[model samples]
Target: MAEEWYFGKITRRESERLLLNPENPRGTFLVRESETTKGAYCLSVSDFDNAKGLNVKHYKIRKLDSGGFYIWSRTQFSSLQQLVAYYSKHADGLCHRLTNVCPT
Candidate 1:
């Protein structure tokens, strides 16, 4: 799956279920349509901290009317794959570098 990371229309609870699974390590991430805005996607990242332990964090990805996507940061990309490459290179504003894809 080239756009392997995109999980299309999984519900928010489903995203949480996959990321929070004990088998998956922290930092794994998936992109999905939470459906709050339908077209807008949500980034669900698995995270761990001293206090919180293994958990997941969700970031809403915004689409530009012109094109591309961005999270909390201004860095933008022309495609979701590009977005994955950028975040995978560095956590940037993400909870972690999208270390693993919740692949199709």
Candidate 2:
């Protein structure tokens, strides 16, 4: 993946559900549909920021049926406070604890 984006994945069910729910928090993200990556989803230029502060761009992802994982990008979160502010009120559940990180 490139340095400007990050990687993210959700369950096939959750992905479909997010696509259905216009109000989904993930809906704040932008995506480009890819035929080679149907079962998997990708965030080409995600604004996601990590604790260390780096820009993670161009990452790959795959949605799972049971458990899934997501890797966030690198960027300047400034401090712990900024990090917390970046991920305010995120969703949690089977799709959460299993991943490295979740989306905004």
Q: How well is each residue in 38-104 modelled by candidate 1, as lDDT tens digits?
A: 6799889999999999998999888889887888656888888888888888987776788988743
Q: Model 1 segments beyond 4 Å from truth?
A: none
TM-score of each: 0.90, 0.27
Q: Write the per-residue lDDT of candidate 2 for residues 5-54, one digit (tens) a residue.
A: 12234433443433334333321332333446675455333233355232
lDDT (C-alpha) at residue 13 in model 2 = 40
Off by over 4 Å in 2: 1-29, 46-56, 67-104
Q: Which lDDT values do the candidates have, in the order given?
A: 0.84, 0.34
Superposition TM-score, candidate 1 onto the true structure: 0.90
lDDT of 1 at 11: 87
Instruction: Report how far off residue 48 is in candidate 1 (Å).
Output: 0.4
